[PDB]
Curated annotation (Swiss-Prot):
Species of the source: Homo sapiens
Annotated site location: Acetylated histone binding: N99
PTM comment: Phosphorylation by CK2 disrupt the intramolecular binding between the bromo domain 2 and the NPS region and promotes binding between the NPS and the BID regions, leading to activate the protein and promote binding to acetylated histones. In absence of phosphorylation, BRD4 does not localize to p53/TP53 target gene promoters, phosphorylation promoting recruitment to p53/TP53 target promoters.
Function in brief: Chromatin reader protein that recognizes and binds acetylated histones and plays a key role in transmission of epigenetic memory across cell divisions and transcription regulation. Remains associated with acetylated chromatin throughout the entire cell cycle and provides epigenetic memory for postmitotic G1 gene transcription by preserving acetylated chromatin status and maintaining high-order chromatin structure. During interphase, plays a key role in regulating the transcription of signal-inducible genes by associating with the P-TEFb complex and recruiting it to promoters.
Name of protein: Bromodomain-containing protein 4
Parent-protein residues present: 44 to 168 of 1362
Record gene name: BRD4
Further comment found in the protein's record: JQ1, a thieno-triazolo-1,4-diazepine derivative, and I-BET, a benzodiazepine derivative, have been tested on tumors with success. Treatment with GSK1210151A (I-BET151, a I-BET derivative) has strong effets on mixed lineage leukemia and promotes myeloid differentiation and leukemia stem-cell depletion.
Amino acid sequence: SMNPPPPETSNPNKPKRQTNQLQYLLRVVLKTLWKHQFAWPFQQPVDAVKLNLPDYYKIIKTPMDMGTIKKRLENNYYWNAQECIQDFNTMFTNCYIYNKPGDDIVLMAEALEKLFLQKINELPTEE
Ligand SMILES: Oc1ccc(-c2nc(-c3ccc(F)cc3)c(-c3ccncc3)[nH]2)cc1
């Protein structure tokens, strides 16, 4: 059926702060993942209509994607790094839930998650 609206990316009513971890998440983690050879399916919300997947949003009730995460970081939407990391993890998990293990799209997600985890391991300590 129809796509839902994309996740909220800006909220004037919620506090804002810049931290070294959040900057790293934007300038390193997001940047690197975005440029990855397998990033394309994950750079925008799943368009279930265009991809002909009418059951996608019947199955996935917490959608997330890197386009959304980019905007969230840009808009200082997150208060802490964990909130952003959760969004990434949600993105991967959604793919794994919706698709079969071994599907090309799943292997692509797994490769991106591997890179993600490497970058998260080098998350600077909160100064
Ligand atoms: O949580 C999820 C679930 C599914 C997908 C997804 N599947 C697909 C997809 C899977 C199989 C297929 F035949 C054609 C297209 C894509 C996709 C592929 C190429 N270009 C743009 C999008 N993305 C992405 C994230």
